[PDB]
Amino acid sequence: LSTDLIKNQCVNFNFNGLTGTGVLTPSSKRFQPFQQFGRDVSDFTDSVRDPKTSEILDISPCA
Amino acid sequence: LTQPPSASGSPGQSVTISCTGTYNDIGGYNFVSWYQQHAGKVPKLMIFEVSKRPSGVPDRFSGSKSGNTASLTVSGLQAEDEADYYCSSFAGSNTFVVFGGGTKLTV
Amino acid sequence: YTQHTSSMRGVYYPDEIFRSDTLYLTQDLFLPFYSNVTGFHTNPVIPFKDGIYFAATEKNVVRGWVFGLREFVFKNKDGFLYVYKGYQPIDVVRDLPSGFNTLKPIFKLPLGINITNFRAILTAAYFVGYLKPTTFMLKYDENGTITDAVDCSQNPLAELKCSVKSFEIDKGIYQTSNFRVVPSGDVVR
Amino acid sequence: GECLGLICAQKFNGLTVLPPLLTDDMIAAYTAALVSGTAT
Amino acid sequence: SQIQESLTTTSTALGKLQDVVNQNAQALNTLVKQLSSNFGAISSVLNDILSRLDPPEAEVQIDRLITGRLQSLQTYVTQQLIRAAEIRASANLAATKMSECVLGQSKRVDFCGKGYHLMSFPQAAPHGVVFLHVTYVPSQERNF
Amino acid sequence: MYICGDSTECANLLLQYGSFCTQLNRALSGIAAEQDRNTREVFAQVKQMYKTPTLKYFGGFNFSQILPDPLKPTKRSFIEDLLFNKVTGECLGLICAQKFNGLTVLPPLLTDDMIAAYTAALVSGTATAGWTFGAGAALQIPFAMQMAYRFNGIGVTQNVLYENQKQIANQFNKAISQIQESLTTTSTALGKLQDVVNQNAQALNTLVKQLSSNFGAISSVLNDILSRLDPPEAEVQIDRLITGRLQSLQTYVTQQLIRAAEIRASANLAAT
Amino acid sequence: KMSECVLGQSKRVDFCGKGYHLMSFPQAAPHGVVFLHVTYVPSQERNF
Amino acid sequence: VQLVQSGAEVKKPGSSVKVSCKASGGTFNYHVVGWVRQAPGQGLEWVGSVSPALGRTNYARKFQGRVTITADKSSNIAYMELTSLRFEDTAVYYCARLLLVEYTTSSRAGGYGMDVWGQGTTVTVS
Amino acid sequence: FGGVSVITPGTNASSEVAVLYQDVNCTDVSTAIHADQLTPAWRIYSTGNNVFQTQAGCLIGAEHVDTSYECDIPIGAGICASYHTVKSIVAYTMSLGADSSIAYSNNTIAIPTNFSISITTEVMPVSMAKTSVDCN
Ligand SMILES: *[C@@H]1O[C@H](CO)[C@@H](O[C@@H]2O[C@H](CO)[C@@H](O[C@@H]3O[C@H](CO)[C@@H](O)[C@H](O)[C@@H]3O)[C@H](O)[C@H]2NC(C)=O)[C@H](O)[C@H]1NC(C)=O
Ligand SMILES: *[C@@H]1O[C@H](CO)[C@@H](O[C@@H]2O[C@H](CO)[C@@H](O)[C@H](O)[C@H]2NC(C)=O)[C@H](O)[C@H]1NC(C)=O
Ligand SMILES: *[C@@H]1O[C@H](CO)[C@@H](O)[C@H](O)[C@H]1NC(C)=O
Ligand SMILES: *[C@@H]1O[C@H](CO)[C@@H](O)[C@H](O)[C@H]1NC(C)=O
Ligand SMILES: *[C@@H]1O[C@H](CO)[C@@H](O)[C@H](O)[C@H]1NC(C)=O
Ligand SMILES: *[C@@H]1O[C@H](CO)[C@@H](O)[C@H](O)[C@H]1NC(C)=O
Ligand SMILES: *[C@@H]1O[C@H](CO)[C@@H](O)[C@H](O)[C@H]1NC(C)=O
Ligand SMILES: *[C@@H]1O[C@H](CO)[C@@H](O)[C@H](O)[C@H]1NC(C)=O
């Protein structure tokens, strides 16, 4: 099952099993074809690759 | 990277030149090359890998590495070998290539 | 069964995670820098233990694998056989050329196989190395590509670079490790 | 997470940094006053 | 002019202020990184524990993470309190120097610089104060 | 080594608690390094080491017990030898010994007879240059004349010193002898230094003795837990000991950090 | 402060109060001491 | 393959010179092009390099803010621009092909020695 | 057993290092290295046969010299190390200060005939970051 992407607002999300609450925004990160997630220097998801469109989205915390 | 200022021997003699590195440069990486330079000439590669010789070089030229020390051996030294010898090595990616000073060999 | 040295070969991406502009320190099974690689010419059983490195120059002699320059890393970890691949357009007959090639993941197979045995399938040269649970510092560029690496077990300089997570170290004395002397024997009374 | 500039950013872990009350160019006003008082 | 030139090219000159940047960066980095530890739990992620286990078991795994995280906050807070006390001692000394070196003239040996003190200037710096201490140093002695 | 011995089962379980050991190691290395700053700030106020004068009797003022003796085998003054006899794994001598518990003591950078060189330089500078020592180049001054200066700095004119120089010198010399005698026979005189010997001895003794506690475990010995229980159960007992041992290291480190701060305050005052 | 403000006269600026220190008095308080610091403050300046 | 250099150049004590090297009878391909500042009567030192295949560079620390090394694989010519050229920079300035070949940022093979050298571009600075 | 420290002059000067095996007899650690009895083995490491016993442990790779200089990298007891010609890493007993002979006389005084105004600096860490943590 799936839903539409909801962007630039606080969203409860699930990307291929990666879950959390945050704000999904368009991103410039140059992911490799085999990379699904991006991480910050500290070990937090910084970004994800969308499972159906392969676009890259940054994840900000929900205020 | 450190080299002696000179080396010498009789024609027909086995004469060596040593180079000392670190855990980069010579040691750390197996990328130590040697050059032969006569005054007024372009340095000629004599040794490509630590022990591997390139084409166009006679078999009197050989070498090896032990610990952090590299060694060039000229076995059966000829008058035509009165040249400086330089060693260089992969310095790691920030410096990429490092050279020692020349060692002048006299026959 | 001849011998070759692995000159910074066998580095691969440990995971599916994008990191950039950073040095990532991690312990995993990696081909140690300058480990000994067995050379082969032509089908013997070559035991698989704690991960195996394989490469071949062929000509196209290696056309299959049995588990029970084209290069690969095969490791058995947490129920999966992971396979990494890469390829250098360099023409070499009987040696691995010195070089670095980060390998990319191809497969993650949920195979309940106690792999202890490995054999290549040879139709009508190749190399085998072994992985060890060493620690590496992997250098990621701005596009998430590992372009370089430090083997933390090679020498005290490499160890210090890993300890301070840098390729540049300032002046001083730094504690990097701890040593222990190990027993020469067994006394039972 | 320090709201510098402005760009008020947050991290998932609840670790933030509060701004100082007396800012750098307010501190500089006191140092200028102290030097000016010393000089005259 | 010599001070300006030395500050321009010499590193470590302000190492005392750099140290409080680095000490706090490390305290926060070790704190945030403890979130990745399991502390005996199956996994560090609360969402994984809850997805994976029914509540009668999930609660055990969560308590393992709660204990570990309370402990890392306590070690963080304690070292910040000790460190803050050290900073306060420096702030009090700096305040003393401001009063005696800048707003007066010192008669205390080696306080407000080496040599005989004449006057000082309180220049600001990130996380601190740098004093320029102007002193008189006798020289060229003769034997009488 | 403190928490786990030669057990790899313990060593691996310990990694699940995160980087506690690297913070504990930095905290202790941090203060151990600080301890070498404390003696530099206090004693190394000498830019030039002054040679001990061959003359110990200056204007009638006797410094023989303040300065090192040129014939005696030691590098210390007589008073220092007395002070050193009242207060009291480290590789001393040499014999480099170890204990099973990973508790060691590092040597200081500035050793006792190096410290004694600074004290000798400070006294020698005081005796021959006086206060000029702390402000530019040291300037020689006759000792009696620096005393006149010092008397005139307290409102008493210099006339008092020159007219009563014999009595002043005799009171000085007698006062020194009284100090030597009091240090020779009176205990507790150096209690402030004895206290840091005892406080650290206690901190280490309580730390090492926590290794004998079970903390809810069947037994304190990791080898017994592993011999006794299969891994699915042995790990539980080991975690009970790991938690207890991490906690005792944390209480040790915390009290050393607080105590070190108190020492630094004393070092700063001494330097002042 | 007891030693330098009460039993002496201070020459340390802003130590023992603002202004030129003359003398001080150590009044007791719960959990502490309160000093009454008597100082001389110059005033009514004229331009010469 | 023979690397061919410019030469016989004389420059001012505060100037900018661009030295060119062409790969004659072949191409640079994946080879790294290195530059060496051998001074008259002296030993030789690394200046830096460019890898035409990637456009990636390396500089010796001494020249990090002084020398720009580039290449254009479409003309198959390598270049070195020495700016703020000083008297102390007089050198034969050899360029050479390194054995190391770079295919991508994460894949390279061969050693770091240099087989094909140009004749040198002596740059004399007054 | 003991700690291992790596001593470096700084990579801006040299990548050359010396290794200190702490709190150990140098004869025994050297034997264990040659006997392949140490756990954290370094695969291409060589001692270089320059082993110096100090109170802090076995220092390997630093040369011992009989000269003295200001302390740079402290090791322990009076031993410090730095990067010097004999450059290489060297170990030495540190210097305490300049050697100065001050004359003492009962009728002679030195009096400055000139002076120099000097300006020096002091640096103090007045404040730290105002962190805040959301415990929950
Ligand atoms: C300056 O002070 C020193 C230290 O007090 C004086 O030296 C001391 O002189 C006394 C008297 O001669 C010595 O006592 C005697 O020792 C002999 C040892 O054989 C013993 O047989 C006698 O019965 C008596 O106890 C004392 O040991 C000596 N102390 C030291 C450390 O040497 C010195 O005389 C004073 N100088 C001047 C000019 O006043
Ligand atoms: C101050 O009092 C001291 C005694 O406390 C006097 O010094 C002693 O004087 C007697 C003679 O009356 C001598 O026999 C002693 O040897 C002296 N002793 C010392 C210095 O220990 C001193 O003269 C008095 N001074 C003044 C100015 O009255
Ligand atoms: C090759 O390396 C393995 C370790 O990976 C070692 O056990 C084996 O003895 C080596 N064989 C050689 C040098 O022939
Ligand atoms: C990342 O890819 C872009 C092309 O999309 C390229 O211009 C850039 O140089 C690459 N960055 C790195 C570090 O390779
Ligand atoms: C808040 O969000 C708005 C967009 O809605 C943006 O323009 C602004 O810069 C942000 N920051 C602040 C401090 O207002
Ligand atoms: C004169 O003063 C100098 C110190 O500047 C000192 O070294 C020298 O010995 C003195 N001369 C005499 C005769 O004492
Ligand atoms: C080290 O062991 C030897 C015996 O092999 C002994 O003679 C020596 O005193 C010991 N200690 C030191 C510091 O060398
Ligand atoms: C006289 O003194 C006052 C300060 O009380 C000052 O403000 C005023 O400018 C001075 N007058 C002149 C002429 O400078």
Residue numbers in the entry:
A (entry chain C): 515 to 577
B (entry chain N): 4 to 110
C (entry chain A): 30 to 71, 78 to 94, 96 to 104, 182 to 237, 251 to 315
D (entry chain A): 820 to 824, 831 to 865
E (entry chain A): 914 to 1057
F (entry chain B): 722 to 809, 820 to 824, 831 to 1009
G (entry chain C): 1010 to 1057
H (entry chain M): 2 to 127
Paper text:
SARS-CoV and SARS-CoV-2 share 80% amino acid sequence identity in their Spike (S) glycoprotein. During S protein processing, it is cleaved by the host protease furin into S1 and S2 subunits. S1 consists of 2 subdomains, the N-terminal domain (NTD) and the receptor-binding domain (RBD). While RBD mediates attachment to receptor ACE2, the purpose of the NTD is poorly recognized.
While antibodies against the NTD of MERS-CoV and SARS-CoV-2 are well studied, the structure of a SARS-CoV NTD-specific antibody in complex with NTD has not been reported. However, only 53.5% similarity between SARS-CoV-2 and SARS-CoV NTD was observed, finding cross-reactive and neutralizing antibodies against NTD are uncommon. We used PBMCs of a SARS-CoV donor to isolate mAbs that bind RBD or NTD and cross neutralize SARS-CoV and SARS-CoV-2. The long (23 residue) HCDR3 interacts with NTD residues 201–202, 211–215, and 273–274, while the LCDR1 makes contacts with residues 280–282, and 623 near the NTD-SD2 interface. The interaction is mediated by extensive hydrophobic and hydrogen bond contacts at residues HCDR3 Y104 with P202, R109 with F213 and T273, S108 with N214 and LCDR1, Y26 with P282, N281, and S623 and G31 with Q280. Interestingly, R62 present in the framework region of the heavy chain mediates salt bridge interaction with E294 situated in the C-terminus of NTD, potentially acting as a stabilizing contact. The LCDR3 residues S96 and N97 are also within proximity to the spike, allowing for some minor contacts. Additionally, structural attributes and genetic determinants of the mAb COV1-65-SARS-CoV antigen interaction we defined here can help to guide rational vaccine design approaches based on the incorporation of critical antigenic determinants driving neutralizing antibody lineage maturation. Similarly, prior work on MERS-CoV that established NTD as the target for several potently neutralizing and protective mAbs showed that NTD-binding mAbs can be a critical barrier to infection, and the sites of vulnerability for neutralization are attractive targets to include in rational vaccine design efforts against SARS-CoV.
